[PDB]
Design a protein around this ligand. Structure first.
Ligand SMILES: CP(=O)(O)N1CCC[C@H]1C(=O)O
Ligand SMILES: CP(=O)(O)N1CCC[C@H]1C(=O)O
Ligand SMILES: CP(=O)(O)N1CCC[C@H]1C(=O)O
Ligand SMILES: CP(=O)(O)N1CCC[C@H]1C(=O)O
Ligand SMILES: [Zn+2]
Ligand SMILES: [Zn+2]
Ligand SMILES: [Zn+2]
Ligand SMILES: [Zn+2]
Ligand SMILES: [Zn+2]
Ligand SMILES: [Zn+2]
Ligand SMILES: [Zn+2]
Lengths: 408, 408, 141, 408
């Protein structure tokens, strides 16, 4: 019932310090005490965490757990069973890197959420988007330029990241469907992307009437809309139509970022995926015109991080890795810390991330009352982001809802 | 690549005796040498088997790997991912119990066959049937006596064991669909059964023209048809239409058994499943009017086995357990031995079983040329059947295609 | 052999007639093939082509096993003959040839894996063979 | 590679002169040098162009490539194979008449654009519209006054000029469909016309909400909308919604032209089609009620050209000929020159035309950096317009993207 971490170096993220020789006391699934006083441990089971960093469990705000290979066109067409199977090693690897919670950006449903919560499957807590919503010819339209046949399979394929739905009532019905299927939030494709063969990244997707409808039907279900957009043009219209988070956001202007502050909109950049698709683009089986499109978004990637920071736009942690590139997930910690410094790179995974998933008091912080999603780390992350960003080299313990899940 | 099992007592099922202190030599996935002579092991990896029985890994000719709970109507309605996830323990348990090869009688497909063969999932080698074929209101039709709306989802539900097809041309299309989907054989429902709402046991299912259509299209893909049948009336019509194996067959007369012998047809009795549904039928979620029907077939079960032996109809090993009752799987050995002697009961799962799945000489035998699907046994199964039928208490090594999978 | 959909999943190919790059269309059933033959003839065809066994350039069918039921092949043959023409039929093994010829097809395409028994039958039934050996060397190379 | 046109009379369109004995230096596909200074050619190929007009390749902003014959009813119903085949002489002829780029106004798809650019087909560069959008009973609706069955064959039939779409969500999807199929711009029927069965020229087509939905979707894929509109009433409503170019426009008032100037809306008047339809209308199989309808649009046709010039509305080149009437293509040069002067008539197919296709400073102007689409013209077009408008009687060399395509 009760577990004690002893002599830990507790990371207080808002105060920006390592509280050494602090004990974390856990009862069931929740943190009951943080103290430097000698704890009366009686019946309680103890883990000795002397001279090691105790910090909250990471929250990757942008994953594709069901992206078992780098070609998303071919990923959707794989058998339903095989699709499900192949996501299990991905989920297991994510947890052992420290990610106790993930926000799936398209693919994962409520079944995978239960699988992890029931303990039938090992891995992070999933906040599923269901399928992503995409227009015809959009970023989730993986049909060739050949000709157009109707896919009722868009919902049926468990390997499919997105579905194709168009029209105000069509997208309205789509949202109500995805919510009752069990989704925690709604994904949409608000602009062109890199993976889909048909659309350039410069141009916008969905009419403002569609986007507003999707927002309103998410808000009515006590949730929000996460939106894929690159250009500041596309980001402006998404946020003015009332989306809560912007994915990637690589090619913002400072006027677009100023509006995001002014609406209270978050951004989850995913810079580690483009640097992966640089070295291993068509090398891992992606279409050449997608690899030709990946060369341009990375350039203004680290640049945009400053732009959001100037404007005061809260930034979350995202990987967006596909297939065998999933192992590079922790590498985003490094990439972020270079530009913004480690404290802010750790805030992306913890306190900001937990606000994005609407679990502010519950997750991403070691406080009395919060869920026991904890990482025991060897060495200081504030003094060295390498103790986090070396494929999770220096994480020995992962605790999720009280119970210890990983030992290394 | 070269493995030597040394000093074990090889089971010869043709002769009916142990061949003691004989070595099995594996190269890759195949058996190259069965000898008692001082074998030369240069670059070979050895396991000491002295004083333990070496036998071929058992083959189950009737399982539902995807049947995760005893209500098959509710097993069909469960989400796809969750349906797949739940079969992974079932597969693993079967492999540990000693079953290296199972024949799925409706539920599993090509994806699960791929998952075990590439080594993505621990389990036995699957001979899938895809979805079983049932007529309207037949044994696969899990619709209640209320109303009839089209379940186009019959193919889409991964948890569903059967699809509902009617008509000579209609069933022809379904077979062609199932064969291209990748089924190894075709399963149909030729009578009423226990686990279905709207149908008594005594009556027959499908027309002879519908069965002949199915049989013809399976033969035209160089495979066979398995048919679910209970009564001698329902069995004889199926066998006259050219079905190769008859599943269950609890209520035969010797005339129907004589016809089976003459047509060269097989029987897979599944006696353990009725014993488990006798104790824990209504307990484990099965509807009361199904547990009503289970009483009337389990009576004649052991009596049928005698008739099959008398007419000389070849008998294969079948468990057919649903849900948590999958644990009882090995116990069918004990039941068959209690009526036929354990030489015959071991023949159910090795020699005769491999003939059924058309692997005569390739599986189910310890000979030069055969695949290395082997089991190492702590005792002599010829003496005591309980050394096999104790949920794998006395099995330490399970080898599958040359590689050792279970060490216990 | 005319179905080129992978082992993934099966939604309807209504495009099979519409796509001008498709060598084939999928049709099943005695009345389904009768309608198909009637369609192809009114479109302007001079002879009717069927796939009557497995082949090479299609993914989910071994060359050894036969395609179409004997009631389906007879329906096609008779609908071809009724429009004063004949049936050509893709067929490799002797087994697959014999049945097609016995259902009244006139020409056997490829026919690579004959025995003398099925060859004797074609002599008696007045059936032609079109071997196409040069494409097998090309695809090996 | 590198090619030099030497001693040519280079036509500067924005300054309105012939710079004689100026050489042109081509490298690969573009123009490096336009100068009179002596030509340094080590390893450079030379074409001797002494005392001949070197001028940029002509751009027609309204063709019908697939219009094999005058009746668009029977042009739609022709087979897909034969439709594509008959367009190949039609494309070839245009190129040999000095046309290096055409903008197809319905009919031609991305396939034909690929065929020219990968040199599989001799012809100009095509800027495809896909299919023209039309409402039911509209200018693209070629169904008679019999009855109405559903046409999903509109996209299927390759020889169909237009497809029939209705409704705000109907057109929104329609535009999305056409863009992913590879259209460079969107064509709509925004009033009645001549070659359709049911609509008079006086009445307008599509609601303001439909046109806006088409414009918003085209702008969202960084392109624009071309609209067929005759009357001043019909033109103004299309312009207020925001169509960028107006086709024909034969019946304008100056109020509508003033609005177009202010909204920056171009016009492509296609007068040469009506003169051909006056003498060869009933002669070439087009139904006599369409030949009755052509009586009024040709009158004000020349009269409209002055109105656009007066209100400052930019004017582009358009032939719009159908079938065998494609021979008459060059006639529009001479027709325009009589009203507006031959310098203005040469701007129509060069500098103004390149702005219409968004290729300003790339095509239609000889400059440093511009794509090498060049036409060698025997004689001076600034003096005699007949050197251009005599079915291309006085053109010998046509070069397209660096490489030479014609010799006469
Ligand atoms: C799975 P996704 O569509 O979010 N994605 C993969 C890499 C970058 C980004 C993109 O294609 O724009
Ligand atoms: C689904 P099934 O037909 O294999 N079956 C399950 C238990 C006994 C037998 C029955 O219902 O009669
Ligand atoms: C177009 P086809 O089906 O006649 N064909 C192409 C090469 C060999 C032969 C084959 O696939 O069996
Ligand atoms: C099909 P279209 O609108 O280009 N067209 C053909 C000839 C003139 C003009 C017309 O019908 O008004
Ligand atoms: Zn995205
Ligand atoms: Zn994503
Ligand atoms: Zn059964
Ligand atoms: Zn069964
Ligand atoms: Zn062939
Ligand atoms: Zn036109
Ligand atoms: Zn027009």
């Amino acid at each position: 019932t009760i577990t004690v971490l002893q002599g830990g170096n507790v990371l207080d993220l808002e105060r920006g310090v390592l509280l050494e020789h602090h004990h974390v006391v856990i009862d069931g699934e929740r943190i009951v005490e943080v103290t430097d006083r000698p704890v009366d441990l009686p019946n309680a089971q103890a883990i000795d965490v002397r001279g090691k960093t105790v910090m909250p469990g990471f929250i990757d705000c942008h994953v594709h757990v069901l992206a078992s290979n780098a070609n998303l066109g071919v990923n959707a067409t794989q058998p339903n069973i095989l699709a499900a199977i192949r996501s299990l090693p991905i989920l297991d690897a994510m947890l052992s890197r420290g990610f106790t919670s993930v926000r799936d950006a398209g693919g994962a449903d409520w079944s995978l959420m239960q699988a992890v919560e029931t303990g039938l499957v090992s891995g992070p807590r999933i906040f599923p988007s269901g399928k992503a919503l995409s227009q015809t010819g959009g970023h989730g339209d993986f049909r060739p330029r050949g000709d157009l046949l109707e896919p009722c399979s868009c919902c049926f394929r468990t390997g499919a990241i997105a579905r194709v739905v168009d029209g105000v009532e069509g997208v309205r019905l789509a949202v109500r469907e995805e919510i009752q299927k069990g989704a925690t939030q709604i994904k949409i494709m608000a602009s062109g992307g890199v993976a889909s063969p048909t659309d350039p990244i410069a141009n916008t997707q969905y009419s403002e009437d569609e986007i507003r409808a999707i927002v309103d039907e998410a808000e009515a279900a006590n949730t929000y809309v996460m939106a894929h957009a690159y250009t500041g043009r596309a980001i402006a219209r998404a946020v003015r139509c009332g989306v809560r988070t912007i994915e990637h956001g690589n090619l913002v202007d400072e006027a677009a970022a100023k509006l995001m502050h002014e609406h209270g909109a978050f951004v989850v950049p995913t810079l580690v995926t483009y640097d992966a698709l640089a070295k291993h683009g068509a090398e891992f089986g992606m279409p050449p015109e997608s690899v030709a499109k990946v060369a341009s978004v990375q350039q203004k990637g680290r640049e945009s991080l400053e732009i959001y920071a100037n404007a005061g736009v809260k930034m979350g942690f995202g990987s967006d890795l596909l297939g065998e590139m999933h192992a590079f997930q922790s590498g985003e910690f490094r990439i972020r810390a270079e530009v913004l410094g480690n404290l802010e790179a750790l805030r992306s995974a913890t306190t900001v991330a937990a606000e994005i998933v609407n679990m502010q008091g519950q997750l991403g912080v070691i406080a009395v009352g919060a869920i026991a999603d904890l990482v025991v780390l060897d060495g200081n992350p504030l003094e060295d982001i390498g103790v986090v960003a070396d494929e999770g080299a220096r994480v020995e313990y992962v605790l999720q809802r009280g119970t210890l899940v990983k030992r290394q």
